[PDB]
Each structure stands twice: as structure tokens, then as C-alpha cells.
């Protein structure tokens, strides 16, 4: 009974292990792409308001 419980117990929780590792990997993929498009989107609202003033600042 000990070795039977150990075998099926390992079966169940290793399957939960792989379920976990996909269940967090692909979700952090989709959030990372959302935040990449978010930071590019907030950036591409001012990208020539900044470069105009700093090319003013560089030029003597």
C-alpha cells in the first residue's frame, strides 16, 4: 500500500507541476506583450516633442 500510494501520488502532483508551469509561462508571455505595446504606445505620443527640444538643447 505504501508503494502504491507513492506511485499514484507522484503521478498526480507531477501532472499538476506541468499544468502550473505552462499556466504561468504563457500568461506572462501575453502580459509582457501587452506591456511592451503599452510602453511603446505611451512612448509614441511624445517622440517628436522630446527630440525637438533636445536638438534645440544640443545646438549652440
Amino acid at each position: 500500500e505504501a508503494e502504491a500510494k507513492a506511485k499514484a501520488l507522484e503521478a498526480q502532483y507531477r501532472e499538476r507541476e506541468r499544468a502550473e508551469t505552462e499556466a504561468l509561462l504563457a500568461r506572462y508571455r501575453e502580459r509582457a506583450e501587452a506591456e511592451a505595446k503599452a510602453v511603446r504606445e505611451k512612448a509614441m505620443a511624445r517622440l517628436d516633442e522630446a527630440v525637438a527640444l533636445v536638438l534645440k538643447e544640443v545646438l549652440p
Binding site: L9, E10, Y13, R16, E17, E20, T21, L24, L25, Y28
Partner: peptide, 13 residues
């Protein structure tokens, strides 16, 4: 085996 799944939790996140 719960601690090993905890390692999976922390390390994958």
C-alpha cells in the same frame, strides 16, 4: 512533493 511543487511555483513565476 508539495515543497517541490512550491519550487515550481516560485521559480516559474
Amino acid at each position: 512533493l508539495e515543497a517541490q511543487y512550491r519550487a515550481a511555483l516560485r521559480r516559474a513565476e
